[PDB]
Amino acid sequence: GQYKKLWYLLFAVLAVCFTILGYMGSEVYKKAPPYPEQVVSASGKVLMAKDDILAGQSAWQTTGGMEVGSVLGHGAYQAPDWTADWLHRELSAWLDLTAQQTYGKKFDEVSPEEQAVLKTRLADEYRNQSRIKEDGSVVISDTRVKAIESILPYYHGVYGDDPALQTTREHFAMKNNTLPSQEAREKLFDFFFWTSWSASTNRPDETFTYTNNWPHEPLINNVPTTENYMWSFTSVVLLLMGIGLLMWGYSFLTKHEEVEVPTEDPISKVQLTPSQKALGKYVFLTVALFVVQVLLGGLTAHYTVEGQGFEALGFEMSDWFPYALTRTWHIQSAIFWIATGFLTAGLFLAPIVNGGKDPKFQRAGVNFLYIALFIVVGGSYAGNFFALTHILPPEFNFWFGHQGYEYLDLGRFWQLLLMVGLLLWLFLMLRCTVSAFKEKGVDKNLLAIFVASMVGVGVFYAPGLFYGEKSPIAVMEYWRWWVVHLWVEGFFEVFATAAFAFVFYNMGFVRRSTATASTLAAAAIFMLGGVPGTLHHLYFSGSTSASMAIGACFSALEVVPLVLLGREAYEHWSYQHLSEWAKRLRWPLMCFVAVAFWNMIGAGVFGFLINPPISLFYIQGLNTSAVHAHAALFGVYGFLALGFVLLVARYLKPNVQFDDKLMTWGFWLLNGGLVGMIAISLLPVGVIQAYASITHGLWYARSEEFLQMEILDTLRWVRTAADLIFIGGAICVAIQATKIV
Amino acid sequence: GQYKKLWYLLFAVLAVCFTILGYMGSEVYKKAPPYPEQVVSASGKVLMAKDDILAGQSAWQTTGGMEVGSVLGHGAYQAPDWTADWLHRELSAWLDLTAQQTYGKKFDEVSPEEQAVLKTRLADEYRNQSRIKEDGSVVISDTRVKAIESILPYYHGVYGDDPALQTTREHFAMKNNTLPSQEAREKLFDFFFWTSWSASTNRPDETFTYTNNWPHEPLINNVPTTENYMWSFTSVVLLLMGIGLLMWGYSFLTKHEEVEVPTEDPISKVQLTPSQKALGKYVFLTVALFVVQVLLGGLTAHYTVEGQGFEALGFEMSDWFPYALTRTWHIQSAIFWIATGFLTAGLFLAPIVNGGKDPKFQRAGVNFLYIALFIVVGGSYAGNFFALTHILPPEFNFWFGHQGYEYLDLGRFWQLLLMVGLLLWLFLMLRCTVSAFKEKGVDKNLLAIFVASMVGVGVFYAPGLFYGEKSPIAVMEYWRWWVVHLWVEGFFEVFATAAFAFVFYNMGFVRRSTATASTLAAAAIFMLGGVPGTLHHLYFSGSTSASMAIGACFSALEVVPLVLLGREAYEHWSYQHLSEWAKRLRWPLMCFVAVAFWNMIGAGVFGFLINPPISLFYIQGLNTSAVHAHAALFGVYGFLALGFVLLVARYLKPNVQFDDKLMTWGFWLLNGGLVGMIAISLLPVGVIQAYASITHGLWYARSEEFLQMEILDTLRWVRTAADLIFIGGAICVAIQATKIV
Ligand code: HEM
Ligand code: HEM
Ligand code: HEM
Ligand code: HEM
Ligand SMILES: [Ca+2]
Ligand SMILES: [Ca+2]
Ligand SMILES: [Fe+3]
Ligand SMILES: [Fe+3]
Structure with missing residues (x-):
């Protein structure tokens, strides 16, 4: 259409970045x-x-x-x-x-x-x-x-x-x-x-x-090598030069237009199809795994202060559920409920795009996807439990047991089953849109980018495959970060942005041109530094010296959009003061204001602390990676998933109010616990542990007598005071979301 | 008044920063x-x-x-x-x-x-x-x-x-x-x-x-020490945390109000007093030293490629005007014409504030200040010439010769004479305002901050004194950066901001509240990191390890306001499209848009490249300091001075137009020369010179055979191709400003 310059700029970014990334993967095979x-x-x-x-x-x-x-x-x-x-x-x-x-x-x-x-x-x-x-x-x-x-x-x-x-x-x-x-x-x-x-x-x-x-x-x-210093002083220049140059474009190329909203909730007029009414069990699961995943976190944090159990009435606790098992379950469940929230938020929009109806037997496919998800989550957790007690024979360990690589801990059989489920979900989403593409109206531009992101989030779990049991370490370390860094940190920040613009355009909050030109220009900046920045996970694991020059300079253009995110947090926070019907979807919009806050303090401030090659040299493997992990992952994608299922809960039982005083506790307890278990436990330990690794070496900061120091021990003990608050906030949000449905 | 919170926040910043700075100066005396x-x-x-x-x-x-x-x-x-x-x-x-x-x-x-x-x-x-x-x-x-x-x-x-x-x-x-x-x-x-x-x-x-x-x-x-690494990884966190947190405040605490301008140029109605008509000779001097100062720059850059002269008809060139002499003159003249531009821009506003008139023998004082300025600039340059040929006896060398410390090269007698001239200028400025303070109107708030900045820029040249000829090096290194860093990089960015708000409020471009609350909140951020950041000039010259912890973390809050400066560049650029009379003051407003650009690429991007203690360790004394020097100093304060004297030229001969096609060449030639002599000569040499100092040592990057390498020699030779452009732009701007008056 008229956005032909913005589409070409996006095709020119994908072509040049996926070659820098693909060429530096042709060298991992022959330089490892x-x-x-x-x-x-x-x-x-x-x-x-x-x-x-x-x-x-x-x-x-x-x-x-x-x-x-x-x-x-x-x-x-x-x-x-x-x-x-x-x-x-x-x-x-x-x-x-x-x-x-x-x-x-x-x-x-x-x-x-x-x-x-x-x-x-x-x-x-x-x-x-x-x-x-x-x-x-x-x-x-x-x-x-x-x-x-x-x-x-x-x-x-x-x-x-x-x-x-x-x-x-x-x-x-x-x-x-x-x-x-x-x-x-x-x-x-x-x-x-x-x-x-x-x-x-x-x-x-x-x-x-x-x-x-x-x-x-x-x-x-x-x-550190010499170019280790040079390419680390260079990325800071690129970061500071892009921050102030995009703030220069925003101020000359944005007029702050004004819109009048419709009179009554244009989405609450479409009646619910038989498939959208099946999504009630998808919401209860997104907040049931969330409370199970947070309990396992406090249960695996218990082994770090004692090492043994409490249960002197039965078996041995650390023989069947050791630290490795609870840690695997607590990391894997954080992917399942987040992905489930995104899946249900998509499956709700699918029928509305198809005018108002379901094309064939959507309720059958939706229930099939539910059953497959439970089979995956159950069989994976059963195979992890048996593969660690060594009951399972060792030859079937890579296919039905424990892969041994974090974020991909589930066996390969369950991995293939999950990929098949993802392809089925993508099939449903694409099936409910072919009638909206085939139409003699105008401007299918905002819909094309949306289905583009839908395809992206569903297809890029395949690179987790094509690495075997006996493949070199530096090779799996290169295909693992195609699904953990690219399929999450760069393809979920395009689906979420497109879904924001799509939803908020259908509700009359933004103009047609403002929502399809700003999204299509934010889908290029999120891939200019998001795609080749994959190599900032492969600095010191068997890659050449050019990988830490490409990943260091490109992942700096990855923070540039994130620190100027207070611009979109004011737009989302003001939408609630536009009507008396838009004031009902207040807590969904309040989570989207927290997503923008943690996308700049968790993924932009603490994410760049460990980005430069000279910082990560002394820091890789310490408790700053955990600060960044919790802050970024939860603060961004956890609030995204919670807001999506809270917006799907509404419009699904449009007769129940949101109980402000239960959500005022739930929201601020989560936001106060996340800051609590970072500023008083995780960051102090990470800073005391960084000082020791710079003077002596990584062998010292991680040793047994260093982690047991009567100061690092009364500091990972005080973390429990800030984790019960977080568990309370999760309990409040879960209770509310269950009361609604 | 009603801005009692904004005034207290400013008094609480000055009290706590001038104690961190004063206490760390009580240790330079007893730890050097x-x-x-x-x-x-x-x-x-x-x-x-x-x-x-x-x-x-x-x-x-x-x-x-x-x-x-x-x-x-x-x-x-x-x-x-x-x-x-x-x-x-x-x-x-x-x-x-x-x-x-x-x-x-x-x-x-x-x-x-x-x-x-x-x-x-x-x-x-x-x-x-x-x-x-x-x-x-x-x-x-x-x-x-x-x-x-x-x-x-x-x-x-x-x-x-x-x-x-x-x-x-x-x-x-x-x-x-x-x-x-x-x-x-x-x-x-x-x-x-x-x-x-x-x-x-x-x-x-x-x-x-x-x-x-x-x-x-x-x-x-x-x-580098261990805390050299720690306090350098910390300042980056503070910088990135303040950038995105001030962009969060700007987006929630600023409503983008709209104003209608008066019908005709409310300043062009006040007729010129006999003293404002004396300021015609002040404008010709601000652009005469500017062309003299830029020629000496190209003349001192000639010794770096040959070492000798061209003038085989007379004397020896390098015996009377050596590299040291032309460098001293080329650095000292850059302070004189900048300060002269600020002085004349103030003396023009002084009578307008006093209603419309001159109180007493004001024109006599203006002519006296002119004569004193010429005596200083002439006697200093005469004493520098004699003190290097060793004609002057050596006992009178500190008082009438060459101090030997850059940016304070003039002898102490001329230094005291300049301080007396500055006190006289301050006296005139304050004398023309006591009738505007004594008044039964309302809201003298925007005038109080203005006279505050006027006092600041005139008083803080005194710390250049109280260090003698035989005082320890680490002591003068501490009082020299009270006039070079504090009196320029932190007190000229308050006078300029207050003068912007004052002028643009009198011309009806901004509201009364927007101009006195944003200025009074920008006078606190420019001193929160500007005052204690002085110590980033004293890292490795005899100061303790706490000085490079205080200066490293505070001078990071000194870049925070500078990179979000595209917000005020759009306001200044739009003011010209508001009337057919405001379209005459176009080139003054065009220099203020260039001030904001270089205040973020010269003083914020290349200024933070060399700020962290681990960057400056290998980099202090190389050609990156010259990149930063030229970019920051000219790009900010040179365009400020030029815009001020171009706005004073207008309103002083309100019958001559500005000759667009001569200023379109003058503006872009300056802006293209500054980028030219940075991207092709200065920065490449600085980067090749940084690589050698990290592997071998500073003794190598500065040695004789390294600077003569057939690559660093054909690179400081190509700098001449980008300096003739700059000289041409300076010639164009000078010709225009002389044609006007
Ligand atoms: C009370 C709440 C929580 C507690 C006590 C907790 C505790 C922990 C512990 C002890 C670890 C492992 C540290 C180690 O390996 O030594 C960990 C890792 C992790 N947790 Fe949490 N956690 C909590 C909440 C969450 C939430 C809500 C998420 C949401 C995504 C999450 C995601 C992760 C991730 C991704 C890691 C991996 C970190 C890494 O590998 O560096 N956690 N957490
Ligand atoms: C936007 C959402 C983001 C999420 C959810 C996220 C998540 C994570 C997680 C969980 C880890 C731990 C990996 C491990 O333990 O092996 C990690 C590592 C890392 N993150 Fe991100 N991240 C995000 C954005 C960013 C950004 C924008 C940067 C920019 C520099 C960044 C820089 C890094 C680096 C350098 C590592 C390696 C740390 C290590 O290997 O110890 N992250 N990320
Ligand atoms: C064609 C124009 C110019 C040329 C060729 C030039 C050249 C030079 C040279 C050769 C030096 C000394 C380098 C050394 O010590 O080895 C220098 C330093 C300096 N020049 Fe320029 N210059 C020019 C314009 C300017 C302008 C317009 C200003 C305005 C303020 C300026 C301010 C300075 C300053 C402050 C220094 C000191 C740098 C330091 O000490 O690190 N120069 N310039
Ligand atoms: C805003 C206007 C500024 C001007 C006019 C300016 C001017 C200068 C000049 C001329 C020098 C060279 C001093 C010398 O040769 O000894 C210098 C040094 C330095 N500047 Fe600034 N500067 C400004 C802002 C900043 C800012 C905001 C920072 C923030 C980090 C900064 C960081 C530094 C550092 C670290 C040095 C020491 C470099 C060295 O000693 O070699 N400057 N400045
Ligand atoms: Ca890890
Ligand atoms: Ca110098
Ligand atoms: Fe990453
Ligand atoms: Fe400074």
Whole structure:
């Protein structure tokens, strides 16, 4: 139509960004750290062939995966980082062995000059002993073989049953036999060794490791590279130059037009079809998983202060429901109820778009989608419970058990079933619009972008597939962030914006041109830095030095739209003071004003704190990622889902009022709990934990005696005072939404 | 009045910030690096007592001061940094002497292990050999005495006459006998030694030097401290949290009111008093110094590519007008014409405020101020010329010669004379308002803030005094930035804002309440981060570690108002499309739209690039400070001064039109030259020079062979293509402003 410039600008953004992203994925396949054919000692004692590295990667997913610790930065934050911990134990062992056969003392009775000699001899057998080319063989001296063999007792004790290594499994919140089979418990440490090898060995040509000198290890001069500084001083310039240049466009290209609303609620005139009346059970589920998901959060936060249970009447608590299991359930349920809220908010708009009716048997397909959703959520949680007690045979662990990679913890069978359910939902949504496209009216522009976003949110769960059980780590780390970063942080902020404009145009709150030109210009800024910014999750996990130059500069244009979001929060807050009928949809509009607030304090202020490559170097794997996780995820998409189901509750029982005094408590208790469990517990621990990782190293900030310090312990204990408030607010909102329906 | 909350908020900001600033100045006096009583060798050979350090600091100001090089970071950018250069030469000499008496090789035939031993022995005689307490004595080993004595030939040759050290004085753009007296040329190197001593010696209690580990020197582990990282990750959070939270206030607390203008130019009805007609010679001077100041800029940029002259018919060019002299004149003239523009813009408003008349002998005072200004500008430039040829006796050098500290280069006599002239100007301005205060009308609120800013800009040149010739360096470095940072970057952005609101309220463009509540709320944000942010100029010059925590976090609230400045650029640009009489004052309003643009790209984007303590660590003293200097200073205050004198030109000859086609060239040539000499010459050199200082050290990025690299030489040569454009634009604007009057 007349928006032909705004459509071309959007097609030109998608073409150039999906090539920067696709080309840098063609290099992850051919520049990732390789699995060496053999790791031979210097003498010739072959040790740890590659198929044992793969058997250890498979044995790692049966222990809980990234939910029990963290490997190469990604994982949980209670047990240490196994790469940065193995590396330091092996380095200190090598040093204490070489200091004995040279001077006769244990590296600490040794004077600083000889400490310098020993350290400059250490960081040359680790760094410049790369993978031999023309054959995947890695040659290791005979002191490094004795250093590895002397630290294996500790790890056998921490992952197995050992009366000596109690009080260290309780501090890591680990069940006793995390990996019972001692035959597989030794192949897992081959995988741990390989991960610490790729993190301390120079690339075949450069002077930095395969992980860009990650993590911080002063013993071998693991420090930020030079372009690590340059590309981090550059992204700040791009951010500050785009913030004030978009505020310059907003002030010259926006006239603040004025509209008069209709007299009576133009959506409350369309009577409910038989399919829209089926959506009553979809609303109760979006706030039932929400209360189940928040209880599991307070139940997994209990293991971080005690490590054991309360239930001295029955079984062992930490044997069937350990920290890994409750953490997996508490992370997975946060995706299900959010996605359910978006699904029901779409399925409500579908029949209204088709004039006023349902084309065929929508009520049958809607009920089928409901049943499939329950099958997925139930079978996934049953497979997670069996795959951690090791009742399930280990060969069926990747397909029906626990994948071991967070945000994709459900087995592959349930993953395929969920993808099929998503395709069915997309089919229904698209089926209820082909009559609105085929029409001799004018301006189907605002409807085309809407169905574009509908397709996007339903299709981009497929990249979670095409990575197998035995594929390299750096490859799944690249396809996992196509569904966690791209399908959520960049495709849900287009569906939500288009749904805002569509809904608020049908209710006569905005003009036809203002709602289709501002949405179509906000769908380009959300993909200019959203698509190639995927690579800010792959800095230090096996990607080249150009990945952290592309992801650092593009994800800075990803904060530019978010901090100027007080402009749309005033528009949504004023819509309620326009009529006496628009004052009924007040609490739905009040959640959309909170979405805009947390989209700039959670995803823009605390999201850019950890974005630059030099900040994330010392910070990856600490409690600031959890600040950002809770703030961004809930504050944005949780309030989005709650507002959507509260707006669907209304118009579905248009005879029940909203009980202001129950929602004034529910709203502010949620908003006061989220700020409570950030400003008094999460952020102080993250800042004390950041100071230690800059002076000493990541091995220290995550160690057992550092997390138990009588200050970090009375600080993750005070978090409970701010979590009961949050649970109360969730209870209030759930009670209200159930009373309505 | 009714703005009693906005006045109290402003008094509460001034009270708390001027105590943070005053308390951190009470510590500069008692924590600065001290002048040691004696510097005795180990044996007992006393060397370089403190009065010789002071005699060398005095002898340093007679060589040009900070205009010939840079000491401790502050200065010019053609000759090296003398602290970071002396330090590295002495360290490498010490190493090559100790490597001879230990192994017999010159530290480069020496294997890496012995290089580690030598380096860990070097960075313990330099760091942990602090000032002996209870008496100001510093004990130096006998190798460090032989290392100092072996590098003095090079410096005697560079500051004196030596046929061998030609082609190194031409590369530094230095006249031959920069310091002729060999008796004083040796006491200056005592001052150089002391500055490199304070930069490589731990504080009496801490593990960092007196200059917070500056400069970057890998030989002695001069690297950023840990709180250097923490307070730099914190200021970014404050910046991003204030940007989006003020945009949230602007959107909820501003209604976009509408006003109707009067029918005819309410200021063009007041007839000109005999004093306002004297301001015709003030306008010609503001654009005569502007063309003289821009020519000296292109004349001092000529020494950076050749080092000598063109004038083979007369004398020696680089003997009477060296690089130091033209640089001093080109920096000092930029303050005079800017201040002159502000002065005349004030003296024009003074009689209009007094109803319509002049109280007493006002025109006599105006002519007296003119004569005093010419005496100052002439005597200063005469004293600078004589004090560099060493014709003036050296005892009268601080009072009538060259102070040696940039932005305060004029002698102290002319400084006192300028302060007296400023007090007289303030007297006139305040005298023409006592009848407008004494009145039984209402709402003298918008007039009180105006005279407040008038007092501020005239009084705060006094802190440039109370520092003497022999006061410690860290003390003058603290009083110099009370007039360069506070009296300009924080007191001229209040006078200009108040003058905007006052003028545009008298012409009926804004409401009475909108102009006195937004100005009074913008006078508090410009002092919340403007007053304590002074300390971001004192990071690495002798201040404690708390100064770079206070200045880093407060100067981040100093960018918050500047990036959201596209909001006031649309208001000023629209005022011209309101009448056929308001369309005459178009080019004055067009400069105020450029002031707002450069106040966010020059002072907000490139100003925060070098603000954080970890950015400035590797960057202080490079060509990014010049990018920021030109962009900020001209782009903001130059366009302010030009717009003020173009608005005073009109209303002073209300019969001459503005010749659009001459101002369309003048405006865009200036705006295209400023972007030209930044994006093609200054910024590329600064970025290539930043990369070298992060890998090697500041001694390398500033060295002679690095600045002569056939790429940095064909890049400061291409700058001339973008400077002739700027000179052309200045010529156009000057021609127009002279044609008017
Ligand atoms: C009382 C309420 C809550 C409590 C006590 C809580 C507690 C926790 C705990 C203990 C963890 C794991 C920390 C670790 O691995 O050491 C976590 C992680 C997480 N929680 Fe919550 N949570 C709560 C509410 C929520 C809500 C409402 C959401 C909504 C999406 C949510 C989403 C997440 C996510 C995404 C993570 C993963 C963080 C990461 O992997 O870095 N949580 N939470
Ligand atoms: C808008 C909604 C957003 C959501 C829901 C979200 C969610 C998350 C979550 C849950 C994590 C934790 C991943 C993990 O534990 O492995 C994460 C990581 C991260 N986020 Fe986002 N995010 C959002 C926006 C942003 C934005 C705009 C930025 C801009 C810089 C950003 C920067 C980062 C970075 C650098 C990480 C990596 C942290 C780490 O790996 O420890 N996020 N995000
Ligand atoms: C064609 C126009 C100009 C040229 C070629 C020019 C050139 C230069 C040069 C060569 C320097 C010294 C660089 C060094 O020390 O190595 C300098 C510094 C400076 N110029 Fe300009 N300049 C021009 C215009 C201006 C204008 C219009 C202003 C208005 C205020 C200005 C203000 C300054 C200031 C404040 C400095 C000090 C920079 C510092 O100390 O870091 N210049 N300029
Ligand atoms: C608004 C008008 C401003 C003007 C006219 C201005 C002017 C200047 C000038 C000429 C310099 C060079 C000083 C020297 O060579 O020693 C400088 C330094 C500096 N400016 Fe500003 N500035 C302004 C605003 C700002 C702001 C808002 C910031 C915010 C961070 C800032 C940050 C800095 C820093 C950190 C330095 C030190 C650079 C160095 O010492 O090399 N400036 N300023
Ligand atoms: Ca995680
Ligand atoms: Ca300077
Ligand atoms: Fe992301
Ligand atoms: Fe400043």
